[PDB]
Design a protein around this nucleic acid. Sequence first.
DNA 1: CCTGACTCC
DNA 2: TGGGAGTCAGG
Length: 578
Amino acid sequence: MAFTLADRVTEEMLADKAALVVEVVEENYHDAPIVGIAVVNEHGRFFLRPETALADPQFVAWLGDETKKKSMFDSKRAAVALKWKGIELCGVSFDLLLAAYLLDPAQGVDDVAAAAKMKQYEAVRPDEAVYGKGAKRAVPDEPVLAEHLVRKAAAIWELERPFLDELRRNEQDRLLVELEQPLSSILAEMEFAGVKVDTKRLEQMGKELAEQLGTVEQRIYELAGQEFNINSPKQLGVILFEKLQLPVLKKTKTGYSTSADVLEKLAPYHEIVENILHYRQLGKLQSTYIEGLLKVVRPATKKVHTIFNQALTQTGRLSSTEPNLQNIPIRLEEGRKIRQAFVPSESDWLIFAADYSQIELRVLAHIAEDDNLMEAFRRDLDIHTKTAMDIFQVSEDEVTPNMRRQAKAVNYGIVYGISDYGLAQNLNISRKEAAEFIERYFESFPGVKRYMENIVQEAKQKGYVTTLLHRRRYLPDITSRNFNVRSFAERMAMNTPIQGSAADIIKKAMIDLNARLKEERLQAHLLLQVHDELILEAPKEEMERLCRLVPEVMEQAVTLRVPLKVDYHYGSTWYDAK
DNA sequence: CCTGACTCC
DNA sequence: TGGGAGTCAGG
Ligand SMILES: Nc1ccn([C@@H]2O[C@H](COP(=O)(O)OP(=O)(O)OP(=O)(O)O)[C@@H](O)[C@H]2O)c(=O)n1
Ligand SMILES: OC[C@H]1O[C@@](CO)(O[C@H]2O[C@H](CO)[C@@H](O)[C@H](O)[C@H]2O)[C@@H](O)[C@@H]1O
């Protein structure tokens, strides 16, 4: 494959359509080096040294010109790496990573060669083959690097039309061009902005937490009558089931289980299990949300810059890494205080948080077209209280707080394909009763039962299920003769349209919201998405406007057979936005 | 490296 | 024997 290893940018490199590679080899692309650039267009194939091209005013103009269209793979990686150099990338019209992901998330496409494999294109090597793995990873010599980047650009160039044609075939071209590609740009902005962190506060928390871990630890050794590694399920298992001879409720492939559920169930036998559960909660706060977080905060700006993986989950959700900012504690007050350390990036700005209320159950109502469930939402009746009345067969007055929490377990459990066994184990109740709860649920919401049956039938017939905005998931195990393998696929068939349609909706909301913020020239901007909620920061002056704009945009992103409902709060820290 | 903890939706 | 994720310590 012929290409020019160029020493300067020329006009023919700047055509109004091109495949572009802006190579960042570090997995975490924030403030990462760009090791090489390739361009393929109608006029030829070119390799450019970053030091050259990125200092060349014409090439920089071209990159930032939205009418000069680029086809790329993982344009967010390039856009963010470029942002860290103060260079704007616009005009990305095709992203091969996002296209491959929409066509089949199960393939786990993470490099151009893997995408190319989908169309039997083989004139390009896998990245791991060129760079090496683990401790062996290195940028090769220029001629080897140059050929690799050009081959990746040539592949994107040849593969664009084939991928667009299949997407169009699948009714997924708009999903790519109108949803995922614009979202990619919004996520790039979010990641690059980062979130500001009050490190003094975390370090203090860590100091205090270290004291308490030592206290709990020593008390556990007292109760056990022995020292051991409490963070070793293997050692813990010997203490519990051999030394203290507590009952063995469950084994894993490797040995005795010490899961939270098992330890909870052992509480009537020995008090130490409650101490141990507490110790492990504290240890995770320390290791992950104090120490782990502080490791990744940029010391001069005190910001953390997550990476949202847009092409990973099997249902269309994002994930968040290094650090994961989608699993910051909230359920326990001690852990929830971590959120006091997430603060606005400017003086006199505030954090604004908006969350969909029960979006999965509303989506289930919509998709199952169950009159009873639809009506409950149409009238905004508390769905957990409703399900309690049905599964316990009582009037609204007689529903105790605990009955509501059990009904809640049923409501989400049904959405996740739970069995009477799992429900009984989760609520620690009789399995006979758990079975009754489920039978009563289905008797009360017959449309949901028909949905579960129908969607499993559809998956068997088509080989995949689909979401509201035409995302798909293939389920080749759905007709397996093996009960376990088939059962798992059946649960995926039932859950994916629900979870994935919810993901579709919040993504569209993010796009609609950014349009409105820019439309109104507000300084407010998105910081995070946490599956069913959006977190922003803005000047304190803008709260009044956001209180109106943010929920309206989120609620109206799509129109279902039931309303969508959005709650929202704001305050001086993420913790206080409640 | 994998497993089994913890955390979130 | 409930869906979708990431990180950490221990082994
Ligand atoms: N028994 C339960 C309860 C909750 N969840 C989950 O944890 C998430 C958050 O649940 P939650 O906040 O409690 O939902 P709400 O309906 O809003 O509860 P509530 O009305 O009391 O505020 C859910 O999306 C679901 O993934 C679950 O898996 N099993
Ligand atoms: O850049 C995000 C994009 O890159 C991929 C590889 O193509 O994932 C890589 O980067 C992730 C973010 O740092 C890492 O978590 C990872 O392990 C690495 O392979 C895609 O999966 C992702 O969408």
